[PDB]
Design a protein around this ligand. Structure first.
Ligand SMILES: Cc1ncc(COP(=O)(O)O)c(CNCCC[C@H](NC(=O)CCC(=O)O)C(=O)O)c1O
Ligand SMILES: Cc1ncc(COP(=O)(O)O)c(CNCCC[C@H](NC(=O)CCC(=O)O)C(=O)O)c1O
Lengths: 400, 400
């Protein structure tokens, strides 16, 4: 049977308003819809497709593991998860890992661990979580309660207790809510969804000192910011501040559902048998693919190529903006970039984005005031230039 | 990179104790480890691998979609999700579906939906969830609080509030906790993890009556009992009692990570734009696979096949039990089967499950007193007999 966009509004729980067109296939940073229209993809499946669409090596790893076995569940380990655990361990501060299937799942694990850890070493009452206004951490009750966007949490109250929000990049705000009762401080190194806003180096370093003083675990939510996105493997390396726990997802599987929690030995020791779990996490399908992703992403060449591409993007966006007077700022790190709208245009991020799509380029928002770019890490100069060309046309169309 | 079982104990957060051997490939209901030892697999990936290991048609569906595109995020829908939704909608009470990555995310979506519906139609005071002791609903903070194993949640307190547990199969225990402050009652049609305990028809009609009297959503957690498992497509069809929400995962994806919330038009209307969502949820790879799974399982020959298979397993577990007197009962429905231990062997299901791995058959537990069988719905007659012969041999060693 034949499928059309109107089918989405009769069949799907109305949680999203997706685009009027329906993608059917893609290669690298180009995607095509059911009528053959071609888009340059700067959405990057919301910062996931780090190698672009239908990558041939990802496919080959996919179809090679798929012809062995896909899944047993965690009664049994497998070679792919173990290899991926090693890669991740060797490449980061981590001594151990847990695999799950989403960014939120990864965050659930991390907040669960810090909680058990605090209880087990200090007592039932050291249960506080500090997070940040505008943070986004997931849509599970706990993660969305840790998130600092109350419009996402209010309807599903009572919310789990002992969660407080401080102002991002505001060290005294944080200091005031962090004490001996705090078990965890969870933070994104760049707030993604809340408008591509990068932590300051003194802010992050400041939470690290606060966590030490109060015996609280510091947790980096790198589901958006990780696996190459900033030009280092993880943004913590860019800042030079090391967390107790790090969560990772999205790009980890370059399009396959996977997530993981990276922990130190000491922290890991806290989670004994049967204290957490997941049916699908650690499957060898996900693991063969993530493994090949890390193998391709975590190379001096690919990562420097991200620093290179950051400059191509910002430079052309600054030139677009000079011509059209749209934004007050282009900010971010690596290939997570925000264009902040000016006073004239504020709250119109989505309309620009819809224009973009009309002009054959896919971009994201990040709040109604930021247009956001999260392209593949291996976008070609040609793809960037022609996508920015069409962005430029959309900006013309929009500004009149 | 060489990989051995001792590596697990150094690389993984020690949340599982898995088998001392490592599977590396499978076909239908046989699996093989790194040294070529062979198993009959009656664990089924814990009730996931409804079509067994490395199924030709599921790989063809994987590879086919894999070569077009994997993922965009939900800013854009796709044809396989929409196809999948339509199949779910056509085959059940549901009018609309939401897609995510795991049974726990399914249960988040359903619990969240019940709460918002209550709040909107009656006031934010109506937040009560009623669950059952020994229930298992997932490892997110909210879902492990809905679940009835306090051991799995206590370490992570404070827990989201307003959750009560009644007694499974005891309509009076339910009745005493469900009132007009109740938003949701969530129940497994067979308690899975907690002992393979089937619900009676009266207990289920009772909750439906009681949910109608008090305006609470009745939620059937069909993540284990779903997708052909019981002999019908979903258990609720066996029992003739219709839920307001139905969650589903495991076998839905044949091994691919997928899950879903199934809802009526009424309840689906409640989730408006931006109120929930997931990065990976509803990607076209998952969707193409589940799509195939539904096609291959929702037929009269498989589902009848599952009734026929139930018979093989039970004629034979009786025979074995005659010889070794191990079990006070054999219970469950279709291909979810619990063998309950006698008081002389109480707490030794795991020991049994180990001796069976040594004998080359994989079986599950479901608490210390049940050996659980969750084989592929397409297991063959030869594969059932061979795996029971080895389960019989294992039973012999265990008894002496
Ligand atoms: C920094 C950060 N941490 C955690 C998570 C949670 O990851 P999941 O893998 O999604 O569990 C995220 C992910 N958030 C991306 C927002 C995804 C959804 N948005 C859309 O579908 C956009 C739809 C549209 O544009 O119409 C959502 O859940 O709201 C993260 O970034
Ligand atoms: C009825 C029911 N509802 C929900 C869920 C949650 O599904 P996920 O898809 O896991 O989020 C389940 C799932 N559970 C089967 C047990 C899952 C884990 N088991 C193991 O890791 C086995 C370990 C071993 O045997 O050594 C777990 O969380 O513990 C469900 O059944």
């Amino acid at each position: 049977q034949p499928i059309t966009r109107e089918n989405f509004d009769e069949w799907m729980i109305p949680v999203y308003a997706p685009a009027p067109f329906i993608p059917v296939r893609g290669e690298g940073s180009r995607l095509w819809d059911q009528q053959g229209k071609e888009y340059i993809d700067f959405a990057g499946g919301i910062a996931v497709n780090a190698l672009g669409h239908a990558h041939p090596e990802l496919r080959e790893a996919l179809n090679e593991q798929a012809s062995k076995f896909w899944h047993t569940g965690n009664g049994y380990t497998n070679e792919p998860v173990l290899r991926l655990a090693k890669k991740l361990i060797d490449a980061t501060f981590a001594d151990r890992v847990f695999f799950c299937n989403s960014g939120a799942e990864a965050n659930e694990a991390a907040l669960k661990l810090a909680r058990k850890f605090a209880h087990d070493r200090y007592g039932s009452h050291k249960s506080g979580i500090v997070a940040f206004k505008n943070a986004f951490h997931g849509r599970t009750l706990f993660t969305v309660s840790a998130g600092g966007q109350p419009a996402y949490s209010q309807d599903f109250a009572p919310l789990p207790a002992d969660i407080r929000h401080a102002a991002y990049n505001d060290i005294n705000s944080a200091s005031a809510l962090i004490d001996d009762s705090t078990c965890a401080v969870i933070v994104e190194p760049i707030q993604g969804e809340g408008g591509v806003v990068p932590a300051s180096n003194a802010f992050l370093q400041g939470l690290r000192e606060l966590c030490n003083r109060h015996n609280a675990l510091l947790i980096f939510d790198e589901v958006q910011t990780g696996v190459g996105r900033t030009g280092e493997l993880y943004a913590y390396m860019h800042y030079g501040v090391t967390p107790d726990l790090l969560t990772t997802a999205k790009a980890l599987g370059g399009g396959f559902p996977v997530g993981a929690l990276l922990a130190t030995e000491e922290c890991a020791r806290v989670m004994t048998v049967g204290t957490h779990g997941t049916t699908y996490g650690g499957n060898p399908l996900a693991s063969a693919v993530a493994g090949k992703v890390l193998e391709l992403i975590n190379t001096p060449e690919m990562l420097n190529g991200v620093k290179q591409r950051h400059d191509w993007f910002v430079e052309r966006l600054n030139t677009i903006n000079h011509r059209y007077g749209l934004f007050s700022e282009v900010r971010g790190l690596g290939l997570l970039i925000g264009c902040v709208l000016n006073a004239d245009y504020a709250g119109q991020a989505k309309q620009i984005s819809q224009e973009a799509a009309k002009a054959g380029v896919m971009v994201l928002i990040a709040g109604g005031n930021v247009v956001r770019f999260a392209p593949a890490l291996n976008v070609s100069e040609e793809e960037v230039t022609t996508g920015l060309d069409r962005f430029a046309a959309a900006c013309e169309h929009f500004v009149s």
